[model samples]
Target: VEDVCTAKPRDIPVNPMCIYRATEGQGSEQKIPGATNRRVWELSKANSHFATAFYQHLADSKNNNDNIFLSPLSISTAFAMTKLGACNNTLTQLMEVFKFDTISEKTSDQIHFFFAKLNCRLYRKANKSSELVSANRLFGDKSITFNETYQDISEVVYGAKLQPLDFKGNAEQSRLTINQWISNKTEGRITDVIPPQAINEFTVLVLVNTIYFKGLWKSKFSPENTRKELFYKADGESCSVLMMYQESKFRYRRVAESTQVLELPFKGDDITMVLILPKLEKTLAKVEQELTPDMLQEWLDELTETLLVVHMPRFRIEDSFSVKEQLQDMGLEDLFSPEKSRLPGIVAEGRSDLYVSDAFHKAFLEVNEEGSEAAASTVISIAGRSRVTFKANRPFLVLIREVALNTIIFMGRVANPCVD
Candidate 1:
């Protein structure tokens, strides 16, 4: 019998695969050998802090059992770009919220370096087996003159192109154009990130980011093995859903000494899906309450190679949020304060006349036996032996990540798989 892990469908599409590859024939400048690693480390650390705080806020804002999902990277990247044009309290607040204060003094330079490296890593190749694409753009009012320093850093470091539009002349058309661009970038998976009434004649600038990813599993789960299984929700209700099943060795751990952690690698092994299951049904709140970067690291470190049976639901989730209030609740208030906001770097006159009017985000993700596809607006293991069973029959947390860089591209909880 052939190795189950190596078995794959031969009819998979070959062309139009979005892969992360650097441009060829372009002689490039080199950075200090360890510079990229250091910056990525800082970015990851900041991301962890932001994720923890943001997740906590989300949990508190919604019902404890509600499904929660957001793109921390997307939201953080947008804010980071906005930070380029911030000064005074605006800059300080953004820096503190993003945890950039913990990094080097040259905050803007470090953010630029980090995004350039991150973009390159995420879009460096075209693989027949997988696709991952990330894009960033800045849309500004044509009447405004963005500072040269901000423009230069945006283009050179973050690879963002500035597109001047007539936001004041035709706010509706501008919104459509920006939304269309986002939809196209995400392969139509995300649309209308900015609503009709969100932007107006007073709107001076808008920043946008989009990411799309699709990947197949290294170990395929046969369709024949999938069946309608009972999934217990937090409210003690059971629902029938399609559950994908397979038996294989994987890296597994019990986190916080209670939740079970499992790593499921995708094809090419560069990315993985991590599933976190609470030991008892309806106890997901316990896991969420104690979630932290240190705890996550400890779980990863403790992952041991030993697994047997695994069952995961085939599900889809679509989420949208207007995060302005959330940010304000998080103590990032000055950026939205018209009188207190100071973003002198955004305009050439060096006057505090610009501020973020609103912030919006949308995301979608679907997982099945064959593969997974996800687009975020904001926004797993192993081994051996005599078997153990990982039956995800209850509420669980899911994370899709780039393994090497330790970047989390998307995250959500499956409270009720049947409920979209």
Candidate 2:
């Protein structure tokens, strides 16, 4: 059985904290409906506010709202959900899910501060856990250490204590442990995950270590078949990019406006990643602007089980960015403010000393899921020639979802492809 379930290519609700803050007997104030199969999907369908908050918080740029959800809230939600799932009972579950009376605006600010400290603490603690057993034991802890030093984007601050791990081993041992952790968490879909050393001073290094994903494209895009294609850029320039090419028997459908929806299967047929590319103009904004739950659901509903001829490019890319400035640009200043926001976990003494130092996301995936069995097929297409448009030319989002249970594991957007 898969340990963690995730959904991709979709959004969650904006007011996720509302449900977190709501109390029992509050009738319909609760967000997730019991009948929903996907928690993130239900959240997204019930409230775009939660989805928007996640986009703004996780992206390299700030969201367009002041009261956007922060990392702390996301972590809290994760913790609450995990705990709720572990123990099965009605009242206990309700209390676990609904016990947020202490989460006022003031407390919210404190929580945000606590998250910043905790975030750094986790990174710092990683360095100490040079040993495998120590890392695992630390992760098994329920609460985080306070006053541990960790760095934000800028200066160093001390407020949270990071749980120390036994990271005592040769470089390769550390690498293997982290890689295995990622593989186990991702159900072996990802293997080669590397953890970085020295995030910064005041780095507390707490839980939330890292979220990594690596998957081979279900439809193998052949390098020999790749051709130079016209790739569109946001600045309205046509550049040449190497587009991976492949034709396969797959499932696909056409929603409307000449657009096509294709479902490509990865290694485990139970998990598939879908791509919706605009046929007419390759404007990412056009696609994003049209993203609505109903529209997406309708499109998904139209998906029929049929064999499809697929052509895709084999490409790989890595990107990282600091979203502190981006969030401010998006009109979400209050959330970042030390003096005027809601985050209680970090802010305790009516002082604002916490700020999001960095936000980074990385993805490694190939065009085929055959793994090591098909090595010769892994060739670099478009070594040098005409460019292709199959590249992630514009800002696009990725969804890692479980096909069987239809759960969302992780959802992220790429606003800037540079600055890790």
Candidate 3:
């Protein structure tokens, strides 16, 4: 088993990617006492790889355009929260999916504290220039008792608070209450994530995770520079879009002969966006199959500062999904089954009948003149880009991330931005 950081680390560098274990920032803020923790690197890598799988599976050809967006951290964090309550085979299967081979709770505990450290460092690095919020709420049926220890750990480690709702007695108000919380967390950008009919008296539990991000580009695109341009589509039709143009120094890498990568930093510079553009000869879908975390790591690692002209679209994208099947496909199949699942840690000891019924996730992202305003929410009843403009007239991949940890918070593909 790996050495684990049981609590959030007290010291963290503002730009940690430059060093292995930072020596500075010790007792600089909260004054908590704990050693430096770096286990989150693997956790971030795991989620990035998971992000590729999610992008590949979630993309549907029949959809209006291939445009898709998601928060990998939000999705995995919510599930990791669920893992705390999972027991027996359910926990085993989840651990395996998360890439942990051991069964001991001690070995599995590393993921929890690392997540805390990951988010803790992220917020600390997020200066007033950027806005990033990842919110989680658990609504359990008031009648179904949850283990007290599970409740505390969820709050302490994941920052998720459990609020008992009268799902059986007052399903309507429960739905309103949940949606209202979602609205507040997202700053009203996302009004209703859980719809009216989604909640019912039979529903025993529901979990929601949301992320809101707004950052001013360290160097912004002037409004006067935006021009109406044609975006060449996969189907060979040109669509009209507002093209943002800029010439500046940026981190650039050529991932392959046909694929080039570009990095755009938000105001704080700690968090940034990487855009991967492929040659038109290969469709966006074709290149998607070839994406790997190793390649993503190289794209970031190999980037060299270069002076270049950039052209990309001004896009606002909102993507919503029901992710139960998606998670099962990625190897958590047993957790959703009522007959085989074991969640003794969350419920009363004998309550093995309770299982994940559904999962919902939704995200809103806008890449504009200022920077990027991106927010996402995930619920288990739970539930559940770009640019390089060097020019993104066609489809491309987007990874908005925490630079130091190389952790991706949002992943998306922009096919066309004119539509939803």
Candidate 4:
């Protein structure tokens, strides 16, 4: 369907960087809704606020020894689907959780209009060098009567619709079908996101959003330089890890006596990976405390270029976990509460018991000498010759965000590169 977008050819670089204003008689088949660049900027920044907050939430609750990897874009987008059916404080809480409450203006329509535009740009920005894709759908019970307006908005704005499933009569089959969709969407990287007991007879709706990215950057590290290196951890233990080494002038910087930040570009100049590494005197935990939205913005303001000897580990990570409790702690408390839940925007009238019971996230990422088969980057900092070595011998925070509007597709932490 994307083949129909008739974008005008461009010069220099950035393919598909066309002036794609779908006219009535032109490429309108796959055209999505519209919004200004400013709205894209607004939501992108708000998404970052949610991303950093949720990352810290998981970081604090998790064992420091375990690696953290998940997609804020997918998980948050899934929650946003459910939030569209929320009303009253239920919607308000979702707004707060997404940090949209901090925005001074923009009603709900004004806000969601931007989502459609950004999502369209996200799909259109992909090229042969970088492969990016995302899918959204609803596995809803066949017995419920979904609202027409809710269904229409979901279809138009999010490109999703309800797939009727006999959740009550065939819960097992239903779960498997949903799992199959995820596996297909992620190219078998994530086979089963919703686990064994996640669905049951009373299940009303399962909102799902799946996204994946493959990054092939320009500066490919030579595999001959990759060797066994000691990867330090917060657990006071070290392990032998395969580290990819490179000597080049890249964007790198150091934060105020706390940590070092670096940016590694992906195949397309549109996206990159930002790594925030803790310094000798500090732990990643300390940096998380100050990763306030404003503080993070300040840290990302600039990334200077300098010659650095970098040893980045070739890590493969595949992880799955339930994020229900963490979402609750992150201002989504009412979503799981049976009594307090107010999803009035869902069914016509009869159903009031429906609420988000569980949410699970699974992510797979491999970083080697060549680039990554996963996603985003927005790193900016000043560099100096004094500290020219970026060993990444220790754990650090990682973010893969698009440069166009700073959309954080994936966020993770590497505590131990030895395990998957």
Write candidate 2's Cα lDDT for 72-113 as tens digits: 222233223222111112213222322322222222112222
Model 2 deviation from the true structure expressed as Cα RMSD, one decimal place: 14.1
Give the alpha carbon lDDT tens digit for every residue of 176-232 in model 3.
998888889998877687867788867777877778888889879999989988998
**Model 1 agreement with the true structure over 291-336: per-residue lDDT tens digits:** 7755656446646777659999999877788788788998889888
- The TM-scores, one per candidate, come to 0.85, 0.49, 0.86, 0.86
Query: Where in model 1 is the C-alpha error above 4 Å?
Result: 1-37, 105-108, 126-129, 349-351, 378-386
lDDT of 3 at 100: 35
User: Candidate 2: minimum summed lDDT over ten consecutive residues — where?
Assistant: 376-385
Worst 10 residues of 3 by lDDT: 12-21
lDDT values, one for every candidate: 0.71, 0.33, 0.72, 0.70
Pitting candidate 1 against candidate 4, the one with the higher TM-score is 4
The TM-score that candidate 2 achieves is: 0.49
- Cα-based lDDT at residue 178, candidate 2: 43
lDDT of 1 at 26: 33
For all predictions, the C-alpha RMSD in Å is 11.9, 14.1, 8.2, 10.6
